[PDB]
A paper describes a structure:
We previously designed two circularly permuted variants of AaLS and confirmed that their morphologies depend on the positions of the newly generated N- and C-termini.
In contrast, cpAaLS(119) assemblies are non-quasi-equivalent, where at least one interface of the pentameric subunits remains uncontacted. This finding suggests that the α-helix is unable to form the native-like hydrophobic cluster, likely due to the disconnection of residues 119 and 120 for circular permutation.
Residue numbers in the entry:
A (entry chain E): 12 to 162
B (entry chain A), D (entry chain G), E (entry chain M), F (entry chain L), G (entry chain B), H (entry chain HD), ...: 15 to 162
C (entry chain H): 10 to 162
C-alpha cells in the first residue's frame, strides 16, 4: 500500500489470495451475466504462517516486521500468525511444506535474502528455492507467496 | 495486434479439436485427419488475468472477450478470475480447470524485465506450472503472457 | 484499470480512508477511562462515501491517478455506487468545486487530483499558491478531511 | 488562441457545471459523473478589464466576446466594466458577483514584474483577492491576468 | 486535445456553414462573409473508425463523441461503424455519405507507415479516396488519422 | 502468418457489415453501432491471384481458402481466377465484382520491385486501380499483395 | 534432407525394437542383442504437426508420410492431428499416445525463437513435455522440431 | 520464372523441329528454313527429376507439367521417373530415351555444390552424360538443373 | 553419418526402379509415375572397396552391409572385391557389373588432398570411369568416395 518493503507487498498478495479461494469454493453468481471472482483486502478471521531464514538477520528482521504490520492494519490478529525460523535458504521449501499441510493455515509467506554477487556457486541454491515453492502450491492447492530479496 | 486475441483463438480451436478426438462414427479407408473449426458456439471458457502493469492487462482482457463474442460465443459463458501478480496465475488456473463446466482456460499477464534475479526466477516458474497443469488434467491451457 | 504503491492517486485514497474512520471514532461514546486512550484509523472502507475532483489538464498523467484512487476504495471494501466524480477545466477551479462537494451531508471525505506546471513561467506560480491555501481553509471551516493529490511535473 | 479565449471557455463550463450539481442526482447503481457542457445559451456573463497597456488588453477582451458568441450566446447578456488598474480588479469583481443575474465573471489584465518595488505587493494581492471571493460567494470567477 | 476532438470540431463548423450557403441570402448591398458556429443541436453525424490493437483508437473515438455531446448534440443522432483496417475506410465512408440523413462524416484511423512495403502503398490511397468522395457527393469529410 | 489469411478475414467481416448496413435501422433510444461478425455461412467469394513467383502465390491462395472453410464457408461458393502478372489484377477484378452473386473479392500477388524501373511503375498502378473499383462498384475489395 | 524424414525413421525403428523386447527372450549360450529393423508392415503411427510457418511444416509432414509408405506401411494406418502452435503440441500428443492402436508418435513443428522473449519460454517447455510423456506412457515419441 | 517452365518450352520446340526435318523437303525456288512451333498436340514426353532438396524440385516439376498442358498436351501422355540424387539422372534418362513412344526428355534436379568436394565431382558428370546420350540416341534431352 | 550407408540406400532404390521400368501390365488413363521402394528382399549387390587410408574404409564397408541387412536383404547375396587404391576402382567395377547375377554395384574409397598434380589427376579419372561404365552397361553404379 504505502510502506513498500517486500514484506509489506508479500503480505498483501497473501491476504488477497486467501480471500479469493473462499469466493471460488462458495458458489457461482446469480446468472444471466459474466461471472467475476476477486479477493478483497480484509484480514478478518484468517490464519497465516511465515517462514524466514536467519542469514542476514539485520535485513530479514525488518521484512518480517513489515509483513506483520500489514496484517494487523487490515484487521488481522497477532495471535493468528505462526512463525518458523530456518538456518538458511536451502531449508525454506521443506519447512513451508509442513505449514501448508496444516488444516488451519490459509496462506504461507516466505522471506529471505540471497547472496548472488560474491560467489559463482550460489546459483544452484537460488534456483531450487523458486522451484520448490512453486511445486508445493500446485500439489497442496494452497497459496504460497514469494518474499525473497537478492543482495 | 495483442496476445489476448491470439490466446483466445488458440483456445477455440483446441476446444473443438478435443470434441473430434473423443468421438466415434463411420470412417473411410483413407488417411484420417483431425482438425479444429473456429466456431465458438456452445463452448464455455475461463480467463485468469493479473493486475500488474496497471491498465495494460485491461487491454488484453478486452481483446479476449471480443474474439469469443464475434466468433459465435455468448458472454454468459465466460468466467473471469483476477489475481494479484504473475506468480499467482498457475495456482488460480488449476482451481478453474478442475471443474467440468469449463472447456479451456486462457492465461493473461505482464512480466517485468528489470534484469534482477527477483524477476528472472519468477518468469520461469509461470511457464513451467501452466505446462505441467495441462498435461496432468488433460485440458488445453493457452499462454498469453507478454513482457513490459 | 488500477494501480498500487507508487502512483499519487493510491496514497491519497489511503489517507482519506484512515481519516474518515478516525473521525467516527472521535465522535463515538467516550471510553471508561483508567488509562490513556489512543485513537487511530483502520484501513476499512465499508459503509463510507467519497468524492473526487479532477482536472482535465495533462490527460495522460491525470487519468492514471484517478484510476488509482478508485481502485484503492474498491479493494479495501468500498462500493462503486458511493463515489462521485467531478471534472473541471484546470487547477485554478479545483478549490471552488471541492467546496460544493464538502457541504453535502452524505460525503465523508474528498480527494483532490491535479497537475501543476509551476516554475516554467509566471501566471502559474500564482495559481499554485492559491490552490494549496483554498483546500486547507475549506477543511478547517467545514470540518471534513480533504486530501491533497496534486503533483508537479 | 489567446488567453482571453481560454478564460471564456472555462467560465462557460464552470457555469454549466454548477447548474448540474444544484439539480437532481443520477439514476444510481453506478458512479455519478458531473461535467459541464459548452452550450452558452441562456447564460449571463461579466468581464472586468484594466486600462493599462490598452494595446494588449483590447485583444484579450475581443477574444472573450468571440468565444461566447461562437458558442451560441448573445452580446446582450454580457456586462463589461473597466477599472483604472490591476489593484482595482478584485473590488470591481465583487460587485458583479453579488448580483443574482450574473453566473460567471472573467478577469483580464496585464502586469509588469520588472517594475518598481511598489508594484509587487499589488501583483500578489490580485491572485489572493479573487480566490477568496469565489469560496465566499460560491460562484465561479475565472483568471485571465498575464504578464509582459 | 486528441485528434478525435480536433476532427469533430471541423465537422460541426462545416456542417453549419453549408446550411447557410444553401439557404436565404445575407443583408445585401455589401460583401457577404460566411462562417460556421460551434453549435450542434439538430445535426446528424457518422463516425468510421478502424482497429489497431484495442487501445489507441478507442481513445480517439471517445474524444470525438465527447465533442459532439458537449457542444449540444444528441447521442441518438450518431452512427458508428468499425472496419478491419485503414484500407477499408473509403468504401465504408461512401455508404454513410450517401444517406440523406447525415450531414458530415469523421474518419479515424492509424497509419503505421515507415515500417515495410504493403503499408507505404495503403497510406497514399486512403487520403485520395476521402478527398474524391467529398468533391463527388458534396458532403464534408474530416481527416483524423494518426501515425503509429 | 501470411497475407492470404489476413486478406480473407477482412473480406469476411466487410461482407457481414454490408448486410446489416443495408437492412432496417435501429428503432432508437441509443446510439447505433454496426459491426461485422466472423461467420462465413451463406456468403460467396472471389479470388484473383497472379502467377509470378510460382511458389509464393500458391501458399497465399491456400491460406485464403483455409480461412473461409474453417469459418463455416463452403468450397463450392468460391471462384478462382488466375492472371499472368500483377499488371493484370485490376482488370480481372472488375469482371468478378460486376457479378450479382459475389459478396467480396480478394486480390493476391507478388510485386518484384527492387530494380529494373520497368517494375517500379507497375507497383503504383495496382493499388490505384483496386481502390477506384471498390468505390465505383460499391463492393469491398481486399488487398493481399506483398513484396519480394 | 529434412527432419520429417529423420523423425519417421527413428519412429519405425523404435516400434520394431519394442516388439522384440516385449517378446520371448533368447534361450542362452551367447550375449543377447536387440535391434530394430527398418520395415513398417503392420504398424500404426500418429503425427502431430503445428500450423505456424505455413509453408515449412507442410514440407515436413509430406516427408514423414513418404518415409512410412515407401518402407511398407499403409496410408490407412496413419493418424494426423493439427494444432495452432508449438505450445499445443505436448497436450495433443498425450491423447494420441493413450490410444491402444498406435505404436509410435511423431511430433513436428517450427520454433520462431530469435526475438520477442514471449517465444523464448515456449521453446523450453515443448521438449520437457514430450520427454516426460514418453517415460510416463512407455511409448516412443520422436522429436521433429526445427528453428527458423 | 523457373527452369521447369523453360526446360519444357525447349522440349516442345525441338520435338516439332524433328518432325519437319525428318519429313519431305522443300520443292525449291528459295532457301529452306526449318523452325519449331509452340504447339504440343499429339506429342509424348518424359521427365526425370531427382529428390534431394525436397521442396525445390517439386516446384520445378509442377512448372513443367503446367507448360505442356496449357500448350495443348494431355496429362495422359507424360511419364515421370523419380531418382534419389543427381548422380542417378543420366542412367535413368537412357532408359526413357530408348523407348519408341517418347519424343523428348526433360531432366530436372538440384546440385548442392558449395562445399564437401565429394559433390564437386558429381556436378561435372551429370552434364557430360546427358550431352552424350542426346548425340548417341539422336533425341533431344533438355537441361533443367539449378544450383542451390 | 557415413557415405557407405548413403551409397547403399541409393542402390536399393535404383534396383527396384529398374524392375518397374522393365515391366508390363494394366494401366489407367492418368499420368504414369515410376518410383522405387526401399525393400531389399530378393536383390543381389556388389561392393568394391579400396584399402587406402588404412581403417577408414572398413568403417564405410560396415555401414553398407548394415543398410542391406536391416532393409530385408541377406548377407549371402553380397559380393566383396578389394582393390589396392582408388585408381583401380573403375576396372574392378566393370568386371563385377558384367555378370547377370548382380543387380547394382557400390563403390567406396578415400581420396587424398595433398595439393599435388599426382592426386589431382587421379581424382578426376575415378569419377569419369564410373559414370561412363553405368551408361555403357545400363546398370546402376553408386558413388561413395570421400576425401581425407
Amino acid at each position: 500500500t504505502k510502506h513498500g518493503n517486500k514484506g509489506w507487498e508479500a503480505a498483501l498478495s497473501a491476504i488477497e489470495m486467501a480471500n479469493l479461494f473462499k469466493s471460488l469454493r462458495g458458489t457461482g453468481g446469480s446468472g444471466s451475466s459474466m461471472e467475476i471472482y476477486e479477493g478483497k483486502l480484509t484480514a478478518e478471521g484468517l490464519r497465516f504462517g511465515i517462514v524466514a531464514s536467519r542469514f542476514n538477520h539485520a535485513l530479514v528482521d525488518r521484512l518480517v516486521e513489515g509483513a506483520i504490520d500489514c496484517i494487523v492494519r487490515h484487521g488481522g490478529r497477532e495471535e493468528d500468525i505462526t512463525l518458523v525460523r530456518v538456518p538458511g535458504s536451502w531449508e525454506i521449501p521443506v519447512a513451508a511444506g509442513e505449514l501448508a499441510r496444516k488444516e488451519d493455515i490459509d496462506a504461507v509467506i516466505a522471506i529471505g535474502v540471497l547472496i548472488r554477487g560474491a560467489t559463482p556457486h550460489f546459483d544452484y541454491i537460488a534456483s531450487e528455492v523458486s522451484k520448490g515453492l512453486a511445486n508445493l502450491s500446485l500439489e497442496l492447492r494452497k497459496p504460497i507467496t514469494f518474499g525473497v530479496i537478492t543482495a
